[PDB]
Amino acid sequence: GTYAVAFRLERGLVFAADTRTNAGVDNIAQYKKLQLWRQPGERVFVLLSAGNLAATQAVVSLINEHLSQETDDEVTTLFTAPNMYRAARVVGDAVREARSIDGFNTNFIFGGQIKGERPRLFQIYPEGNFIEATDDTPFFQIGEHKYGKPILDRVARSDMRLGEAAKLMLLSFDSTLRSNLSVGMPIDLVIYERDTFDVTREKRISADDEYFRNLSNAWSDALRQAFSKIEEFDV
Amino acid sequence: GTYAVAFRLERGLVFAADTRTNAGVDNIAQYKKLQLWRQPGERVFVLLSAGNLAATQAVVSLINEHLSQVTTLFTAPNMYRAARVVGDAVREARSIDGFNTNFIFGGQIKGERPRLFQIYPEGNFIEATDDTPFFQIGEHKYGKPILDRVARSDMRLGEAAKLMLLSFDSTLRSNLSVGMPIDLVIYERDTFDVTREKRISADDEYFRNLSNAWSDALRQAFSKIEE
């Protein structure tokens, strides 16, 4: 199981993912599902992964292998891609190559920025094809997407501040954690600011984090408070 | 697709279900998924249904067939045995001729308190307690978070009905196989009769204001936590 979510905003991008993997509910482990590539001043990429761990690690391994083995121009890599659409296709080709090497249920959220254009955000499907984020729906979800969605559909906006969207995403995580046990803390969160080409704002939020626990209680109190203000249903 | 939810409370029971069926997203229809049986003063039963329409109607058909002509809903001594009557109808529906029927079965029989059950596809069932005073069948995920945060065993019947409609709204917005109208029934304790009943249409003014007010309140509450 997984829950990973990313936001695409006016001021930049916000990425977040849980760390829980399992081979049955009675056999669990912790794995970072957020990858980060960077050429200082030129480009930043963030990849969130969901699905089978063996399959997702194979896709990440292939991306890192082509970056390392620098010996060709025709084979495009993350660092040789001219724009983020072509960078998304590099990830797509890595998914297709991982299938061909010998179900395959890998889902990714891929985003960042390359110098000369705005920050862009994508969702990669199991087949290798992908879709780009727009202002109409300024976020993507992968893995367990249902528990966290209703708070995003009601509250989320494309003009949100990066820290504001980060708080909303943690409340989305909170709802997911309480109803799906295959999703689990800690949560890796990254904020990317537009035109910086660097990741300075990056936290790992542990299970014992007081802010997350106070934020969870505050939202539950505010909803109980709001619920009581609603007019009574006459029957 | 379906969303149906019921609450088991101190003052009684509350039931609700959507009406949308489909043979693919481009070919839809409307069917009542809440069945009601009653003997004046003796007993009352409510069955919410989810899953394949042919299979769910077959279960309801077998329940009504046995009542016309072996324990039935009206000959069952307690609500636990009444749940087993529904469970046997599920098993019989399978054996006559995949099969993914889920039900919420509740009511009261004279002698004991009102009780609420969830019937699984195999025929076996579980009973509601105060720890988790509700059941969900069909699309259960979108509607759950508001229930986990707000739901209480000592809720009022109208209060629980209001919470259920907010849970319906979030489900309707995200799962399109779920659809209005919504049928809602409130059963009061020791009455053995259904007076408080209502179909909420898609054009209903209260439900539209309920949806908008909840959206505004969550935006207000989030901006309050921001500062």
Side-chain angles (χ1 to χ4, degrees), chain B residues 10 18 31 34 40 83 86 88 95 120 145 157 204 217 220:
Chain B
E10 210 167 35
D18 84 305
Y31 286 92
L34 189 154
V86 175
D88 291 334
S95 65
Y120 282 86
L157 297 170
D204 191 61
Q220 218 76 13

Short mmCIF file of all heavy atoms in Angstrom, two decimals, chain B residues 10 18 31 34 40 83 86 88 95 120 145 157 204 217 220:
data_model
loop_
_atom_site.label_atom_id
_atom_site.label_comp_id
_atom_site.label_asym_id
_atom_site.label_seq_id
_atom_site.Cartn_x
_atom_site.Cartn_y
_atom_site.Cartn_z
N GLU B 10 -28.67 5.28 20.61
CA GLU B 10 -29.37 5.13 21.89
C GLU B 10 -30.89 5.28 21.71
O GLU B 10 -31.66 4.45 22.20
CB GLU B 10 -28.84 6.15 22.91
CG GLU B 10 -28.91 5.70 24.36
CD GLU B 10 -28.11 6.59 25.29
OE1 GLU B 10 -28.06 7.82 25.05
OE2 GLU B 10 -27.52 6.06 26.26
N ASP B 18 -28.63 5.42 -1.51
CA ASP B 18 -28.81 6.08 -2.80
C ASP B 18 -29.70 5.21 -3.70
O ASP B 18 -30.14 4.14 -3.29
CB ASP B 18 -27.45 6.37 -3.47
CG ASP B 18 -26.90 5.20 -4.25
OD1 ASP B 18 -26.77 4.10 -3.66
OD2 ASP B 18 -26.59 5.37 -5.45
N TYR B 31 -33.41 2.89 -8.82
CA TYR B 31 -34.06 1.82 -8.06
C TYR B 31 -33.94 2.08 -6.56
O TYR B 31 -32.87 2.45 -6.09
CB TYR B 31 -33.43 0.46 -8.38
CG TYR B 31 -33.82 -0.07 -9.74
CD1 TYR B 31 -33.03 0.19 -10.86
CD2 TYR B 31 -34.97 -0.83 -9.91
CE1 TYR B 31 -33.37 -0.29 -12.11
CE2 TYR B 31 -35.33 -1.32 -11.16
CZ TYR B 31 -34.52 -1.05 -12.26
OH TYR B 31 -34.87 -1.53 -13.49
N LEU B 34 -33.80 0.46 -0.39
CA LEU B 34 -34.24 0.33 1.00
C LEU B 34 -35.58 -0.40 1.00
O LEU B 34 -36.57 0.11 0.47
CB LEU B 34 -34.39 1.73 1.62
CG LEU B 34 -34.65 1.85 3.13
CD1 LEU B 34 -34.14 3.19 3.65
CD2 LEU B 34 -36.12 1.68 3.49
N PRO B 40 -47.69 -4.33 12.67
CA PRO B 40 -48.05 -3.27 13.63
C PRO B 40 -47.97 -3.68 15.10
O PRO B 40 -48.70 -4.58 15.53
CB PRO B 40 -49.50 -2.93 13.24
CG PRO B 40 -49.59 -3.27 11.80
CD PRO B 40 -48.66 -4.43 11.57
N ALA B 83 -31.60 -11.78 11.21
CA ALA B 83 -30.41 -11.62 10.37
C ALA B 83 -30.03 -12.92 9.65
O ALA B 83 -29.62 -12.88 8.49
CB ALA B 83 -29.24 -11.11 11.19
N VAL B 86 -32.19 -13.49 6.61
CA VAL B 86 -31.64 -12.73 5.48
C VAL B 86 -30.38 -13.41 4.93
O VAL B 86 -30.20 -13.49 3.72
CB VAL B 86 -31.33 -11.26 5.87
CG1 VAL B 86 -30.65 -10.51 4.73
CG2 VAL B 86 -32.61 -10.54 6.28
N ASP B 88 -29.64 -16.68 5.10
CA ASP B 88 -30.07 -17.89 4.38
C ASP B 88 -30.64 -17.57 2.99
O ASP B 88 -30.48 -18.36 2.06
CB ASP B 88 -31.10 -18.69 5.19
CG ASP B 88 -30.51 -19.34 6.44
OD1 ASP B 88 -29.29 -19.62 6.47
OD2 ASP B 88 -31.28 -19.59 7.39
N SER B 95 -27.13 -20.59 -4.48
CA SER B 95 -27.24 -22.02 -4.81
C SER B 95 -28.25 -22.35 -5.92
O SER B 95 -28.07 -23.33 -6.64
CB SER B 95 -27.57 -22.84 -3.56
OG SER B 95 -28.85 -22.50 -3.04
N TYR B 120 -22.78 -10.15 4.78
CA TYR B 120 -21.71 -10.32 3.79
C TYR B 120 -22.19 -11.24 2.64
O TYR B 120 -23.22 -11.90 2.78
CB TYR B 120 -20.45 -10.88 4.47
CG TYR B 120 -19.67 -9.84 5.22
CD1 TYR B 120 -19.97 -9.52 6.55
CD2 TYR B 120 -18.61 -9.15 4.61
CE1 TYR B 120 -19.26 -8.56 7.24
CE2 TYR B 120 -17.89 -8.19 5.30
CZ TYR B 120 -18.21 -7.89 6.62
OH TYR B 120 -17.50 -6.94 7.31
N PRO B 145 -14.19 9.30 6.43
CA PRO B 145 -13.46 10.27 7.28
C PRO B 145 -14.34 11.19 8.15
O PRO B 145 -14.02 11.39 9.32
CB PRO B 145 -12.66 11.08 6.27
CG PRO B 145 -12.39 10.12 5.17
CD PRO B 145 -13.63 9.29 5.07
N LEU B 157 -31.14 11.24 16.59
CA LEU B 157 -31.54 10.61 15.33
C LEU B 157 -31.44 11.58 14.15
O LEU B 157 -30.91 11.22 13.09
CB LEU B 157 -32.97 10.05 15.42
CG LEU B 157 -33.22 8.94 16.45
CD1 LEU B 157 -34.71 8.67 16.61
CD2 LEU B 157 -32.49 7.66 16.07
N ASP B 204 -33.46 19.07 -4.30
CA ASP B 204 -33.75 19.45 -2.91
C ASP B 204 -32.92 20.65 -2.45
O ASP B 204 -31.69 20.66 -2.61
CB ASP B 204 -33.50 18.26 -1.97
CG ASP B 204 -34.02 18.51 -0.56
OD1 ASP B 204 -35.24 18.71 -0.41
OD2 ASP B 204 -33.21 18.48 0.39
N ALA B 217 -17.69 26.07 5.31
CA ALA B 217 -17.24 25.84 6.69
C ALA B 217 -15.86 25.19 6.78
O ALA B 217 -15.06 25.55 7.65
CB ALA B 217 -18.26 25.00 7.44
N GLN B 220 -13.43 27.81 5.78
CA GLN B 220 -13.34 28.72 6.93
C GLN B 220 -12.47 28.12 8.04
O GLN B 220 -11.59 28.79 8.57
CB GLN B 220 -14.74 29.06 7.49
CG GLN B 220 -14.90 30.51 7.94
CD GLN B 220 -15.06 31.49 6.79
OE1 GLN B 220 -15.29 31.11 5.64
NE2 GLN B 220 -14.94 32.78 7.10
#
